[PDB]
Amino acid sequence: AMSDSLRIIFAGTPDFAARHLGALLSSQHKIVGVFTQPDRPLTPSPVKILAEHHGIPVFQPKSLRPEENQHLVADLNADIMVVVAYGLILPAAVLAMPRLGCINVHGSLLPRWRGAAPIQRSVWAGDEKTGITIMQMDIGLDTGAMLHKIECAIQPEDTSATLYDKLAQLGPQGLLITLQQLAAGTALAEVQNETQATYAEKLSKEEAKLDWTLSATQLERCIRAFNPWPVSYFIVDEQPIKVWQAQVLPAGEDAEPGTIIHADKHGIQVATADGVLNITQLQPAGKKAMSAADLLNSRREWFIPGSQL
Ligand code: MET
Secondary structure, eight states: OOOOOOEEEEEEOSHHHHHHHHHHHHSSSEEEEEEOOOOBOOBOOHHHHHHHHTTOOEEOOSOSOSTTTTHHHHHTOOSEEEEESOOSOOOHHHHHSSTTOEEEEESSOTTTTEESOHHHHHHHTTOSEEEEEEEEOOSSSSOSOEEEEEEEEOOTTOOHHHHHHHHHHHHHHHHHHHHHHHHHTOOOOBOOOGGGOOEEOOOOTTTTBOOTTSBHHHHHHHHHHTTTTTOOEEEETTEEEEEEEEEEEOOOSOOOTTBEEEEETTEEEEEOSBSEEEEEEEEETTSOOEEHHHHHHHOGGGGOTTOBO
């Protein structure tokens, strides 16, 4: 039996959003206009490039709050607005306009990881599963009712980069399914449970410094979560050394956090609060990322056992 076609305004900025606009362009839905952030140092956003390529009208208001930028929305005559990593706020007046409202594709399984960095934070906290949630947008920050969710396992080697890639494929599927339910009137909205809510904070160069008072397993999560950016690091001999890969080894003899337990071709083993961090792939400033073997060959003195970082 026949599905239905909606007129849609799409609002998004980054690659994650462009992959959603791509699925929409391939669907039977009608994309009447695309909102995206103003060009920044000047570069057009991936969404803009994709929209222009397909000849869709692009709109780049600095703000949607001022009352007559709101006519941009009203004149497009849309059933719904789809919002993916747009980056500007939708005031109540705009949320109010589309016949079916505004929905958002969010990069976690809500209520968990509301906010700026849900993909990175889910890796960082060692969640077994993450996912995407299709949400009916409302006043608050990622507080809206949940229309649809799809799960994704976080694998042992998943970084923020590889998980981003998985969720960019999953999100468009969830969005398409949800659009069909909203067009047919079959959707079900689930209120978020506020006690399960957590916030996902942006990463910082400050936080990327390896903290030896955490457990080995937490640090290894950090190394994956902080890849591609900021990239976990530690300091030795007044030099920053980026850490790309590590492993988590069983607690041995007691030792003070930060102590080098062993250094060899195997890795560089560092004591933590709980268990041992074996650091297997490292990046000195100005050099290509290399094995422990490579770095120890050049700089053994940095890693003499019993020394503390
Ligand atoms: C880009 S507007 C929505 C922001 C919100 N943190 C979300 O991605 O769900």
